[PDB]
């Protein structure tokens, strides 16, 4: 019988230290991240505006050790955006609880990307498409929200081929920040 | 008598604690103030992770000294 129970790479999860570490390696310094803990968000909006973005660990809690990374993005003016690699509906799940933490007069909109293109691969999409969405939404003449969501969806789907999976799996495996897969 | 506990999401948390007790006691104080159970907490004072039985002046942690709290959470 095919023995050796197999450690699959879709179960590599990023720690808080790992997320900070990924942003540091990319060059954003010692950033402050956010979270939603037992249903109450901690998001430092000063640091958000200073950084231009903030990763937010949702779905964690007293008993929930694993959860869901998303990206909070600050746009031009008082517009903030929520990027969820799982798609528009999932992010709309957090729209409200995150909106109540932003400055008075703010609006928080979810990037309308499609679900089903994530494939259980964590962190890479928030730490890649989120930053690219930030830059897209903050240029002089930004495309509409629909257009950014469309391009983000197409990019995740096209990067879905073998080569892309190999590149992602190399990155995920290179994450010596032991959130086990059973390890 | 007052020590600060700062976190990766930006927060400072004042904790009143006559420096003479134990690290599990600081963990209990943080659990009360923010609801995070003690077993999801790693406490680091001045590049040193803190052992439970070890006491607060074992680690020379004085008043106004600041401890960093990292949570044993992770997400997909």
Author numbering:
A (entry chain B): -3 to 179
B (entry chain C): 1 to 76
The authors write:
While the SdeA DUB, an effector protein from the arsenal of Legionella pneumophila, reacted with the Ub cysteine in the expected manner showing Ub binding at the S1 site, the effector DUB from Orientia tsutsugamushi preferentially reacted with a noncatalytic cysteine. A difference electron-density (F o − F c) map calculated after the MR search showed residual electron density extending from the DUB catalytic cysteine, which we interpreted to correspond to the disulfide bond linking the cysteine residue of UbG76C. The free carboxylate at Cys76 points towards the catalytic histidine, much like the same group of Ub in the product-bound complex. The Cα atom of Cys76 of the UbG76C mutant closely overlaps with the same atom of Gly76 in the Ub product-bound structure, with the free carboxylates pointing down in the same direction towards the catalytic histidine, as alluded to previously. The thiol group of UbG76C points up towards the empty space in the active-site cavity, which appears to pull the DUB catalytic cysteine away from its preferred position as observed in the Ub-VME-bound structure. The alanine side chain of the SdeA DUB Cys118Ala mutant (the Ub product-bound complex was crystallized with the SdeA DUB catalytic cysteine mutated to alanine) also points in the same direction as the cysteine in the Ub-VME-bound structure. The movement of the catalytic cysteine by ∼4.6 Å (Cβ–Cβ distance) to engage with the cysteine of Ub in a disulfide bond induces a local conformational rearrangement, which seems to be necessary, partly due to having a substituent on the Cα atom of residue 76 and partly due to the aforementioned relocation of the DUB catalytic cysteine. The active-site cysteine in the disulfide-linked structure adopts an unproductive orientation which lies beyond an interacting distance from the catalytic histidine (Sγ–Nδ distance of 7.7 Å).
Last but not least are erasers, or deubiquitin­ases (DUBs), that remove Ub from ubiquitinated proteins or trim and disassemble polyubiquitin chains, regulating the signal. Here, we explored disulfide-bridge formation as a strategy for producing a stable DUB–Ub complex amenable to crystallization. To this end, the Gly76-to-Cys mutant of Ub (UbG76C) was tested for its ability to form a disulfide bond with the catalytic cysteine of a group of DUBs. Using this approach, two disulfide-linked ubiquitin-bound complexes were crystallized, one involving the Legionella pneumophila effector SdeA DUB and the other involving the Orientia effector OtDUB.
